[PDB]
Design a protein around this ligand. Structure first.
Ligand SMILES: Nc1ncnc2c1ncn2[C@@H]1O[C@H](COP(=O)(O)OP(=O)(O)O)[C@@H](O)[C@H]1O
Ligand SMILES: [Mg+2]
Length: 382
DNA sequence: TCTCCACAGGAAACGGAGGGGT
DNA sequence: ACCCCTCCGTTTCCTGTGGAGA
């Protein structure tokens, strides 16, 4: 069941950590020279990687980690690497509950007190015997929320209840919501990923392109274009790769032995409409109803005020015979919607006429629509 | 140059539905 | 049986603030 368009689609998929990473050799080499000593060696100095999305932080770390294991497995010095993703499983609890399991512990999914599961960690941990590297990708989330900052700390202290940390995030805006204490070991080595010039994204895809595609089907300069779109903002290779791979996905639909400029634009189109739909589906009821209220007011231009949004929100709820949340919460919900980038909001004074938000819709409207309609409540409001 | 509107947006905590280990 | 958890949308209380009016 092959194609003529792909030879290895999965290589493009969001998990394949490749084995060469163009333009991030130094970040590769440093992390290598900061963890190798556990190989002869032991306890490696703790380290930290701020940077932006699509800079290839995760790619690197996971690679170094693959290799660090590749050697240890050939040498036969126990050296366990564990990967934990703070964002995809979001809370201070789970982040421990996870990091526990890898060394081999039970997943009570709720039971606990973060400390209870922290304890269990250091026990099966300090009953069996080696040196272990934790990688906490995207820990900024961690401190976002309670015991977040506290757990962080513990884990950096873990090493002397008798172990090493690699913290990853995506915002210098974190050197600061470190308690300098926490700050001061969550990164003994400052590993920082400066982003991607276009001809760099160029070169990356180029590479991933021999791996994944058949060797003529990818048109000339299409990759330059993917770069262009991914560079258009801050450099982000996910999106570059996301793009060029959705591009070929879409060619297979339109049944040709080639990708060119079009399938990319149509790629951009498919991606947002699915991102959008995926959110507005996975949105709380009253969250949905606010979104509608915005939809309903941004009819014309008269961008919706926080204020207005509430009252026809109030209208909607009643029109359905439901209780209604607070303005505070409506307000919160707005800011959320804005982060999900399903809306975009300006903060602006009207003089003595108060202070409020102009909210407008950022995403494809009809996208949002069919989304909303699938929920059997909003649907009623036709 | 002060007033005071219409909120923004942080902190806490809740409630009532998932569950613990003694 | 006891008191303890976590979670997630939400409630309560709150303090801050750009600029049109007088
Ligand atoms: N230098 C690179 N060479 C090849 N592929 C890369 C490079 N940097 C990133 N990628 C790819 O782009 C995607 C996003 O990169 P990643 O490192 O996961 O982002 P983040 O910086 O958020 O960890 C990954 O799927 C990865 O395969
Ligand atoms: Mg990542």
């Amino acid at each position: 069941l092959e194609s003529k368009i792909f030879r290895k689609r999965w290589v493009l998929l969001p998990d394949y950590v490749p084995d060469v990473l163009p333009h991030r050799e130094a970040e590769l080499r440093r992390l290598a020279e900061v963890l190798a000593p556990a190989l002869r060696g032991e306890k490696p100095s703790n380290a930290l990687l701020y940077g932006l999305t699509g800079t290839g932080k995760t790619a690197v770390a996971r690679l170094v980690l693959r290799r660090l294991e590749a050697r240890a497995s050939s040498l036969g010095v126990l050296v366990k690497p564990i990967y934990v993703n703070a964002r995809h499983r979001e809370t201070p609890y789970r982040v421990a509950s996870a990091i526990a399991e890898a060394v081999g512990v039970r997943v009570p999914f709720t039971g606990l007190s973060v400390g209870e599961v922290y304890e269990r960690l250091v026990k099966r941990l300090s009953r069996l015997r080696g040196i272990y590297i934790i990688v906490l990708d995207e820990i900024d989330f961690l401190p976002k929320r309670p015991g977040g900052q506290d757990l962080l700390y513990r884990i950096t202290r873990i090493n002397q209840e008798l172990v090493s940390l690699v913290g990853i995030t995506n915002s210098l805006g974190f050197v600061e919501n470190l308690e300098p204490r926490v700050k001061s070991s969550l990164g003994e080595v400052e590993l920082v990923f400066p982003p991607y010039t276009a001809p760099q994204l160029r070169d990356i895809l180029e590479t991933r392109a021999e791996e994944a595609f058949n060797p003529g089907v990818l048109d000339p300069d299409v990759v330059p274009l993917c770069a262009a779109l991914a560079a258009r903002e801050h450099g982000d290779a996910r999106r570059a790769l996301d793009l060029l791979r959705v591009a070929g996905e879409i060619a297979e639909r339109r049944r040709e032995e080639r990708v060119r400029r079009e399938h990319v634009y149509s790629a951009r189109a498919e991606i947002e409409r699915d991102r959008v739909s995926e959110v507005v589906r996975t949105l709380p009821l009253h969250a949905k109803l606010v979104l509608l209220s915005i939809m309903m007011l941004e009819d014309g231009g008269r961008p919706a005020s926080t204020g207005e949004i509430y009252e026809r929100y109030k209208e909607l709820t009643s029109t359905l015979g439901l209780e209604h949340v607070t303005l505070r919460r409506v307000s919160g919900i707005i800011s959320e919607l804005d982060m999900l980038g399903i809306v975009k909001s300006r903060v602006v004074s009207r003089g003595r006429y108060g202070k409020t938000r102009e909210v407008s819709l950022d995403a494809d409207r009809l996208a949002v629509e069919n989304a909303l309609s699938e929920d059997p409540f909003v649907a009623r409001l036709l």
